Amino acid sequence: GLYFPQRLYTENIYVGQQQGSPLLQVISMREFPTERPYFFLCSHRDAFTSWFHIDEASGVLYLNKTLEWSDFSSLRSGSVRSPKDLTLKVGVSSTPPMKVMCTILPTVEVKLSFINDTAPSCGQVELSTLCFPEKISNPHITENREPGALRQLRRFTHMSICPNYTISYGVVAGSSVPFAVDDSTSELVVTAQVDREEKEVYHLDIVCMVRTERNLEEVFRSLHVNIYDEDDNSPYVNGTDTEDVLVEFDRSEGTVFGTLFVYDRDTTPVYPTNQVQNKLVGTLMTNDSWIKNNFAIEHKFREEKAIFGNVRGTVHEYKLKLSQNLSVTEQRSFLLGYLVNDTTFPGPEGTVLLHFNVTVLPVPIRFSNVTYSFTVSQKATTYSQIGKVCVENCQKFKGIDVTYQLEIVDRNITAEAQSCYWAVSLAQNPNDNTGVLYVNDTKVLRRPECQELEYVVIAQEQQNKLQAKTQLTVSFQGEADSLRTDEPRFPACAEKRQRGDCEATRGLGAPTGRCQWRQGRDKGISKRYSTCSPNLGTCPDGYCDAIESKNISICPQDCSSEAIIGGYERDLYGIKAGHGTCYCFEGKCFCERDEP
Amino acid sequence: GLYFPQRLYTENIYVGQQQGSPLLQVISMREFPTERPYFFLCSHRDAFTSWFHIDEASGVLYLNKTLEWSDFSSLRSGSVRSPKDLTLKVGVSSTPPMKVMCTILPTVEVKLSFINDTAPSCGQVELSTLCFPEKISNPHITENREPGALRQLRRFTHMSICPNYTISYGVVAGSSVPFAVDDSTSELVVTAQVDREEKEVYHLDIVCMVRTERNLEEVFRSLHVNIYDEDDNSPYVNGTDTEDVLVEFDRSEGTVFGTLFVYDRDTTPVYPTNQVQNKLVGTLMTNDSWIKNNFAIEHKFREEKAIFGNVRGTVHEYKLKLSQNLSVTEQRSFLLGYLVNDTTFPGPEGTVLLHFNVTVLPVPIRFSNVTYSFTVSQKATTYSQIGKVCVENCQKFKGIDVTYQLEIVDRNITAEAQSCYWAVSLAQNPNDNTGVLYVNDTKVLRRPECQELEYVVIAQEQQNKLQAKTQLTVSFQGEADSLRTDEPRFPACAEKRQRGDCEATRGLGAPTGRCQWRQGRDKGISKRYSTCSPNLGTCPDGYCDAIESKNISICPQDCSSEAIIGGYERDLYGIKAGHGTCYCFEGKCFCERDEP
Amino acid sequence: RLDCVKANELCLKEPGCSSKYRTMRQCVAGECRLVLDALKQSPLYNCRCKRGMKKEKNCLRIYWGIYQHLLLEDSPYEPVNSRLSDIFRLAPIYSGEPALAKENNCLNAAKACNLNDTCKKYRSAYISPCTSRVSTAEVCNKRKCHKALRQFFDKVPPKHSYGMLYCSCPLGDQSACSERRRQTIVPACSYEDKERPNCLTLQVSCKTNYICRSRLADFFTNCQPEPLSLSGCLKENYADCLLSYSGLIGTVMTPNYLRSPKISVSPFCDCSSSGNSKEECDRFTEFFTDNACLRNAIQAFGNG
Amino acid sequence: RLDCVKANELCLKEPGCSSKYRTMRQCVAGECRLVLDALKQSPLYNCRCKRGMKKEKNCLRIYWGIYQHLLLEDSPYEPVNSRLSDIFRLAPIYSGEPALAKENNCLNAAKACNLNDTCKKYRSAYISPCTSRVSTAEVCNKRKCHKALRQFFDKVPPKHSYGMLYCSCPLGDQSACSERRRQTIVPACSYEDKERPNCLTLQVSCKTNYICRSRLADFFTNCQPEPLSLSGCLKENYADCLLSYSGLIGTVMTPNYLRSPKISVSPFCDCSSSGNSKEECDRFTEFFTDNACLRNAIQAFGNG
Amino acid sequence: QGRGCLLKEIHLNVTDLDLGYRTKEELIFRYCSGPCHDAETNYDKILNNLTHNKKLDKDTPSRTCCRPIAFDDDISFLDDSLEYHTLKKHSAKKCACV
Amino acid sequence: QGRGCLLKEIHLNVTDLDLGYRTKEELIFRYCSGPCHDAETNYDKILNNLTHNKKLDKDTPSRTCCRPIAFDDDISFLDDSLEYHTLKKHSAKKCACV
Ligand SMILES: *[C@@H]1O[C@H](CO)[C@@H](O)[C@H](O)[C@H]1NC(C)=O
Ligand SMILES: *[C@@H]1O[C@H](CO)[C@@H](O)[C@H](O)[C@H]1NC(C)=O
Ligand SMILES: *[C@@H]1O[C@H](CO)[C@@H](O)[C@H](O)[C@H]1NC(C)=O
Ligand SMILES: [Ca+2]
Ligand SMILES: [Ca+2]
Ligand SMILES: [Ca+2]
Ligand SMILES: [Ca+2]
Ligand SMILES: [Ca+2]
Ligand SMILES: [Ca+2]
Ligand SMILES: [Ca+2]
Ligand SMILES: [Ca+2]
C-alpha cells in the first residue's frame, strides 16, 4: 500500500560493532493519517538474519550480536575475495504481520557490503567522500498528492567513527523551488503539493554544512527528482471534429481517407502492456450491417513535447479505412459517429465526439462515344505492340479487375478468307487495368483480303459481369519488300550486343521490324547502359509486362532471373546498371565493357 | 562276317511294273567255301516294305505287288516334290536269321529314287548315259586274300526300254593289269591274289560293247580301285641300333638327347583312335629305381612315301628325355635297352632291339684360380653396372639355380669407417645364372676411406648348399668435379626425348654419369628409333634385366606395359619400332616424329 | 570447466541423483527442502558452458530452467576461468599486422580479413544474404543475415574480427573511416527499421529468445563501471567486456556507432513514450551509451 | 517359323503334353510307341530356330537331344523359308557401291567397311585380339579371336561382310588382291598351327561343340552338287550356300583360300595317315575343295 | 554446353595422317571446333582483360576450350606389307565446352 | 593430371580487374598455368599434324587445355560510395589437364 520513494538503501559495515546500536531507519509515506505503520523484516530462511533486530514501530535497525572473525568466514557469497555482498528484504503493514504476510506485498532490497576491517582513522578521509556517496539514485514523487518527509542524508559510517563535531545541510542555488530541509532530523522534505503539468524536472544543488576549526567547510553536490503523472487531465480538440471522405475510384480494402486527432495532457506508458492508463477505447454506435461489415477504423498514438509548454504530452490519432473490396454499382451517403472514452479519468466528462462525412458513389463501366481505330505503319513482327484500350477513367481504378476480349464481325465465310483473322491477338495487364494489342502471325498479311479487318471488343467486369463494346478496325498498308523467302522464324535482338547488327535485325517485338538501339555513356556503373531492345518504351523500364513474359528472347533485361556476370547492379529482377555495353543470351547475361 | 565291297546299291524305279520281276542282286565274298550265305532284308518297321520280296538263297530282289497311282501318295519323304527318296537295309548270314539277327550285324543301305512316270521312249536317250551312271563309287579290295566276283554292271532301267539287242563289256587300255570280265554274267572279276606292297592304285578304262545296225558303238568310262593293307610286314632298321648320350650341363627336365628310328612297311591309321594296327608298344626291362624314376622316353610316328618305291609307308621314332630335375653331384654310366613289339603281326618275330649309351657326369661349382677385381672409371650414379660374376662354365648351366652374396672382410670398426660399405650392392639373374654388381649410394664416396673396399663373394647352390668364395676389391678414383651441392636426387633419362639434354643429364643407370644417346634414321617404322638410354647395352635389348625391374624410370623401353601412343610396333613388352624420335614418361610412352 | 548436459547424463544414471531430481522437478512445480541439499552438491548445480562448441541451446535451457525457477545479476554463460583466455586475447594487437600509423585502421582490418581464408568466407557469407532483395516490399531477409553474422562472430579468430568492428580513426564524422566503421554490420538491414520502439519493450523481446538472453547477461556483468580503479571497470579485464559486447551482435540487440562526437552506442531504440519510467530507460541507455569501462576498452585496442 | 524354347515353355503347361514328354524322356532312356504319336503333333517336333537372336544354344541343345537320340542328313538350323531371305540377300551386289571395274575388289570392300560404323567396329574387334601377343611362346589367344570373328559374321550386314571374304580379282598368285583375300581372316592365328591333323579327326572334333555341329550341317545340305541343272546345285539357290559356308568361320573348321590356280578350299587338315579310309577323306575334301555349286556361287557375287 | 561447338567430319586417306603406315584403306575422321563464349565466367573475363592489358608478361592461361569428352570405337587396318595395326582414341563421339 | 600445370597466385588491387568498382580493398587472385603435353592422345597428335600441314584452311580445334574445374569461395567488398557488391566464381581452387 504505502509506496517507497526509493528501492535502494545502502550502507557500509565493519568489524568491531556492538548489539543494540542503530544502523539505519526507513520511512514510509501514507496518503491519509488513519493508516499507522509497523515495520518488520523478512527472508527468515538464512541464519545470519538471526543477529539483526528491528523495532516493530519506530522503524530503525539494530543488532542482537557482536562481531567476531569467525563470523566472517561463515558468510559466503559467490567469490571469496573481499568485499562480500549480502541482500535482505523488508515490508511494512499497518497491523502485526505473519511470516506469510510479506511474500504477497511489494518489498525493497537492502544491499550492504561487508569488509573484515575495523573503524578507520577519520582524519585521513577526503572532502569529496565526506558527506555523500560515490554514486547516487534519483527518487521520485507523484503529482497532486499529500507531502511528507522524503530521504535521509546522514551517513552512519562517517558519523560514528569521528563524533567530535556537528553537521547540517542546506538547499543551495534555488530560484524558489518547493523543497526544504529540517534541522531536528536533517531530512529532505517537500514544501507542499505540486502539479506535474506545471514543472517536469527539478535540478538541485545541495551542500554539506560542517563546523571545522580551520574554516567553515562547504561541499556542493547535485541531483534532480522526478515527477509521476496521475490522469488528472481530460482530452480536448484543436479545430473541428469532422472530416470529409470520398469513395469514387479507390475501392480496394485497407485504403484510408480520413484524419482526426485528439490530445490528452497525460502520459501513456507503452510498457508494461497489461496496463490501462490514458489508453483510449473507441466504440461505434451504428447497427447497419453493410456499413459496419464494410468499413474499418484505425488507432495509432504517439507522444509529443513541443505543444504543451515543452512538456511531455500524449496525442491519439484516428483515421478511416475499408474492410473488404467493394462493388461498383452502389451509392450511399451518411454520417458515421465514433466515440472515445478515457476510462482512467474519474471525472464526469471523459469523452469526445467525432463525425465522418462519407460519400459512396458508383462508377460507369463504359467506353467513350469515340471508337478505337488503330493501324500499322509497316510490315511487322510477332509480339509487337500497336495500341492500348481502356474504359473511361482507366488510370484511377483500384480494386477493379477487368477482362478484355474481341470478336470478328463477319461470322462465317470461306475458310481462305477466315484465315485473315489470325494476324491479331490480345493481352491483359492487371497493373494498369487496360488491354494491349499485339500481332501473332505474319504469313497472313501477304494476302490482300487481310488488308482490312473488323473486331468487336468486349469488356467484362469480373464481379458484376457487366459488358461494353465498340467497333475496331485494323488496316495494314505495308507492302512486302522482297522478303517472301523468310518463313516464320525470327531471331532475337537481346544478343546482338552491338549497334551495327541490332539495326539490321528482324526479330521479336519489332513493329517496324527493326529493334531499337541505346548508347549509354558514363564513367562506370550507370543506369544508362548501351543495349539493344525491340521497343525502348517498356523493355528497360524496370519490371516486365504481360507480353515480356511470353518469350524469354524478348527483353530479358527487365524480366530475367538467372545469374549475371561482370560489373553490374541489380534489384530483385533485371539489371539496373551494368558496366558498359551489356548484353544477354537466352536467360544468361553478361554486362561488360568493350575496350575496342 | 562277309565284308561288302561297296556300301551303295542304287537304281531307279518307275510306275507300271509287275510282281515277280527281278530288280537287283547283291553278292557277298567269303574267305573259305564252308560258309554258305543266305540273304534277307531288315527294317521291317514301315509298311511299304511288305511289297518287296527276296529269295533266301540266290540273293536277287523281286516284288510282290504291282504299282498304282494311290501308292505314290502314301509314300512320304520330307518334301512333297519329286523325286522321292527311300532307304532300306539288308543283311546276309550263313543260317536262317531272326528279326533280331541283323540289328547286331553290319549292313548296307539301298537308296532308290521314286518317280511317278512310266517306261520312257528308248530312242531318245544319249550315248553318255547309256551304260553308266552319272556319278560312280570306287570299291575296295584287300591284299593277300582269295579272289572272287566284284561288281555288277547291268543297268536294269536301260535294259527293259530297248530289250532288242545284246550288250557286253571289256577292260580297255591295260598294260597287263590283273582284272578280267565275264560273259555269262558280265561281272567284273579279279584274276588272282595281289600284294599291296607292289602296287597301290589301279587306274582303269572300261568300255560298253553294244551291237547297233548303224555301227558298233563303243563308249569309254574310267575308274580306279583301292587296296586295303593287312599287317604282313615286320619292321627293320637302317644303320645301327645304338646312340650316344651325354649329360654334363643340361640337367633340366624335359630335355632330349637321343634319336632312334624304325620302319614298318604297313600303314598306321590315326582314326579311329580305338584301334591297334601297326601301333608300336614299347616296354622297358630295367628295375633300377633311380634311372627309371629319372629318365623318360618319347614316342612319335608319321608316315612316308618316298623310300618304299613311292609307296605309302610308316615310320616310328624314339628319342630320350629326362623326367625330373637332377642333382649336380652324381655320376653314373650304363646301357639302357628299350624293346618294341608290333602286336598286330602274327609271325614268330615282331620286335627289334635298341640301346642307349648314357653317360651321367657331375659338375664342380667353383670359381677360377683367378679373382674378380673390378673398378670404377669415374664418379657414378645409382643403379649403374660395373661387372658380372659367374662360376666356371656359367653360360652352359641349365636346371641350376644359384644365389650370390657378398660380405665385408673388416668385420667391426668405427661406425664412420663402417659407412664406406654402403656404396655397393648386388643383383641376381636366373636367365644367365650370374650376378650383377651395381652401386647403391653416392654420398659415401666423398670420404677418402671408401676409396678402397674388400668383399668376400659367396656362391650358394640351392639344392646342395655348396659354397665357394674369393676376394673382391673395388676402387673409386673419380674426384668430385664441383658437384657437392647435389643431394641424393637424380632425374630420369628416358624422358629427355632429345640429344642435347640427354648428353648433359645425370640420372639413373649412369656409370659415367651421363646417359647414352641413339639416332635411328630410316623411312618409317624401323627397329632403330632414336631414344635416350642410360646404358645402350641392355636398355633396348629385349628381355628386361634384374635391375631394370627396380625402378620404372630406368629404361621403360624394354619393361613398360601401359598404353603407347603414336606410330609403333610392339611385342608382349616394350617397343620394337616406333615412328621416329620416340620417348617415354613414368609408364606412358609416345613414339612420334619431330618435323623440326 | 565442465558442461551441463554431460552432468545431466551423469546424474541420469545414479538412482539417488535422478530420483531426487524428479522429486525436485515435482517440488518446485508447486522434505523438499532436504532435497535442495543433494542437488547443490551435484556438479550440475555449478555447471557452466561456453563458446566454441556446437551444443549450447540445451545447456542454456537446462540452466535457465534450474535457476530461473529457483538474469543479468547471476550469469551462467561464462565461468571465472575466462581471464586466462582474456589476457591471451589481449595480445592480438601485436599479432595483427606490421603496418600501422596510416590514415585509416578499419580499411587495414578489412584488407587483413580479405587475405585469410576463414574471415573472408564467413564475412561474404553474412554479407550476401543481407544484401539480397527478395521482394519489392522487403529489402533483405534479416533472419539469415543475423544468424550468419552471429556464426561469424562466434568462430573467426579475434585478431581479424574485432579489428573491423573496433578500428579507431581520427575524430569527427564523414571521414572515410567512420563510414566503414559504421557500415561494417550493414545497418540498412540488420540495424534499421521503420519505427523506433522503446528500449524496455525491446528488453523484454530479447528476454525470451534463448541466445540474446545470455549474450545480454554477459554485458552488464562484464562492463560494469567503477571509478575507483584506474581501469574504470569492476573485474579489471579490458577484453572480457570486449567479448561480451561483440557477443550481442546479430541478436535482437544489434547496436552500432551513433553519430555523436564521442564514442557512444545505443541499440535501435529510444526512451520515448516511457512515461514515469524514464529513469529505468535512462539507466539502461546510459550504462549502454556513455561509460568509462567501454570507452577505455575500445581505446586499448586502438593503441596498437 | 517359331522357335523351340517357346514351344518348350508351351508344352510345359499342358498336363498331357508335359506328362507324355516325361513318359517319353523315360522311354527313350532305355505304350511308348503310342506316346510317339502325341509328340509328333506338337509344334516341338517340327521346331526350328535361326540367326539374329541371342538365345540359340538352348534351342540347338533341345533339338539335338530330341533327334540325335531318336547330323548332315537332316538339319534343323535353317527352315525352308530362308529362300525369301536368300533372294533379297542376292541383291546386295547392286546395293554395295557405285565404283567398280578397278584392279582390285577386296580393297574396295575393305574401304566400304572402314566407312560404316558397324562393320568397322566389329572388324577391329575380331582383329586386335587375334594380333595380341600374350607370351613369348604363344602369338595370340585364339578363343577370343574365333568368338569375335563369329559374332561379326553373325550381325554385320551381308553387303559389307561377304564382299571382303568373297571378293574376286584377276587370276594367279602374288597379285596384291589375292594376298588380302587370303589375309582377311588373319590365318597366322585363326588358321595355322604347328601340325596338320587328319580331317576326319577334326570332323569328330567339330561334332561335339554345339555350334560348329550346326554350321557344318548347313554346309552339305545347301551346297550339295548336281550337274543336271545349269546352276550346278540341288536346291537352286546361290546365296544359301553363300551363307552356309560363311557360317563355319570361327568354328573349329576355319577354312581359307589355298594356293591353287583355281578356287579351291580346304580346312587346315590333310588326308595323311588315313590308311584304308582314304575314300571317306577324299569325298569329304572333294566336296569341300572342288565343286560346281560353290564355284558358281562365289563367281555370281563377282559379276557385279 | 554451347551449341556453336558442334561436331564435323571429313573423309581422308589413312596416309594423310602421316603416322607412317602404307595402306590404301580409308576412314571417317570426326572432330569438334566452334565457339564456347556463352559458357564463360568472371574468371575468363578477368583473364581476357589482363591479357589485353599485357600486365602478365608471358603467362597465358587458357579460357574455355571445346574439347571432346569421349572418343569413338577402335579401328584396325592392314598395311602394304600385310601387317595389321590398330589405332585407339582417334576420333570424337560427342564434345562439350570444358 | 599433368604436374606442370600448377596453381600460382598474384596480389592485386580490386581496381586492376577493371570491372568498374571504386574501392581500396585488395585480394589474392589464383590461377592455373603450365603444360599438359604428357596427357595427350592420338587425337591431339593428328590435330597438331593437320595444323602444321595447313590442310585445314581455317578450322582450328583445340588440344588439351589446363583449366579450373572448381572455383574458390565467394568474396564481398564495399565500394567508394559505401554500396556492397559480391563476386562469385572468381578464383581457382584446384587445377587439372582437361
Ligand atoms: C491547436 O489548438 C490548440 C488549442 O489549445 C492551440 O494551443 C494550438 O496552437 C493550435 N494549433 C495551431 C494553431 O497550429
Ligand atoms: C446500435 O444502436 C444502439 C441503439 O439502438 C446503440 O446503443 C449502439 O451503440 C448501436 N451500435 C451497436 C454496435 O450496438
Ligand atoms: C637306309 O637303309 C635302307 C635299307 O632298306 C636303304 O634302302 C636306304 O637307302 C638307307 N638310307 C640311306 C642310304 O640314306
Ligand atoms: Ca496534475
Ligand atoms: Ca496528469
Ligand atoms: Ca487522460
Ligand atoms: Ca518492361
Ligand atoms: Ca602284303
Ligand atoms: Ca601290309
Ligand atoms: Ca607291321
Ligand atoms: Ca633390358
UniProtKB/TrEMBL annotation, chains A, B:
<keyword id="KW-0418">Kinase</keyword>
<feature type="glycosylation site" description="N-linked (GlcNAc...) asparagine">
    <location>
        <position position="325"/>
    </location>
</feature>
<feature type="disulfide bond">
    <location>
        <begin position="502"/>
        <end position="532"/>
    </location>
</feature>
<dbReference type="GO" id="GO:0043235">
    <property type="term" value="C:receptor complex"/>
</dbReference>
<dbReference type="GO" id="GO:0072114">
    <property type="term" value="P:pronephros morphogenesis"/>
</dbReference>
<dbReference type="GO" id="GO:0014707">
    <property type="term" value="P:branchiomeric skeletal muscle development"/>
</dbReference>
<dbReference type="GO" id="GO:0048484">
    <property type="term" value="P:enteric nervous system development"/>
</dbReference>
<comment type="similarity">
    <text>Belongs to the protein kinase superfamily. Tyr protein kinase family.</text>
</comment>
<feature type="disulfide bond">
    <location>
        <begin position="582"/>
        <end position="591"/>
    </location>
</feature>
<feature type="binding site">
    <location>
        <position position="143"/>
    </location>
    <ligand>
        <name>Ca(2+) 2</name>
    </ligand>
</feature>
<feature type="disulfide bond">
    <location>
        <begin position="42"/>
        <end position="102"/>
    </location>
</feature>
<dbReference type="GO" id="GO:0042803">
    <property type="term" value="F:protein homodimerization activity"/>
</dbReference>
<dbReference type="GO" id="GO:0007169">
    <property type="term" value="P:cell surface receptor protein tyrosine kinase signaling pathway"/>
</dbReference>
<feature type="disulfide bond">
    <location>
        <begin position="122"/>
        <end position="162"/>
    </location>
</feature>
<feature type="glycosylation site" description="N-linked (GlcNAc...) asparagine">
    <location>
        <position position="357"/>
    </location>
</feature>
<feature type="binding site">
    <location>
        <position position="558"/>
    </location>
    <ligand>
        <name>Ca(2+) 4</name>
    </ligand>
</feature>
<keyword id="KW-0808">Transferase</keyword>
<feature type="domain" description="Cadherin">
    <location>
        <begin position="133"/>
        <end position="237"/>
    </location>
</feature>
<dbReference type="GO" id="GO:0005886">
    <property type="term" value="C:plasma membrane"/>
</dbReference>
<keyword id="KW-0325">Glycoprotein</keyword>
<dbReference type="GO" id="GO:0012505">
    <property type="term" value="C:endomembrane system"/>
</dbReference>
<feature type="glycosylation site" description="N-linked (GlcNAc...) asparagine">
    <location>
        <position position="341"/>
    </location>
</feature>
TrEMBL record, chains C, D:
<feature type="disulfide bond">
    <location>
        <begin position="4"/>
        <end position="47"/>
    </location>
</feature>
<dbReference type="GO" id="GO:0004709">
    <property type="term" value="F:MAP kinase kinase kinase activity"/>
</dbReference>
<keyword id="KW-0336">GPI-anchor</keyword>
<feature type="disulfide bond">
    <location>
        <begin position="106"/>
        <end position="167"/>
    </location>
</feature>
<feature type="disulfide bond">
    <location>
        <begin position="271"/>
        <end position="281"/>
    </location>
</feature>
<feature type="glycosylation site" description="N-linked (GlcNAc...) asparagine">
    <location>
        <position position="303"/>
    </location>
</feature>
<feature type="disulfide bond">
    <location>
        <begin position="233"/>
        <end position="293"/>
    </location>
</feature>
<feature type="disulfide bond">
    <location>
        <begin position="199"/>
        <end position="269"/>
    </location>
</feature>
<keyword id="KW-0675">Receptor</keyword>
<keyword id="KW-1015">Disulfide bond</keyword>
<dbReference type="GO" id="GO:0065003">
    <property type="term" value="P:protein-containing complex assembly"/>
</dbReference>
<dbReference type="GO" id="GO:0043235">
    <property type="term" value="C:receptor complex"/>
</dbReference>
<keyword id="KW-0472">Membrane</keyword>
<keyword id="KW-0449">Lipoprotein</keyword>
<feature type="disulfide bond">
    <location>
        <begin position="206"/>
        <end position="212"/>
    </location>
</feature>
<dbReference type="GO" id="GO:0007399">
    <property type="term" value="P:nervous system development"/>
</dbReference>
<feature type="disulfide bond">
    <location>
        <begin position="49"/>
        <end position="59"/>
    </location>
</feature>
<feature type="disulfide bond">
    <location>
        <begin position="130"/>
        <end position="145"/>
    </location>
</feature>
<keyword id="KW-0732">Signal</keyword>
<dbReference type="GO" id="GO:0007169">
    <property type="term" value="P:cell surface receptor protein tyrosine kinase signaling pathway"/>
</dbReference>
<feature type="disulfide bond">
    <location>
        <begin position="106"/>
        <end position="177"/>
    </location>
</feature>
<feature type="disulfide bond">
    <location>
        <begin position="223"/>
        <end position="241"/>
    </location>
</feature>
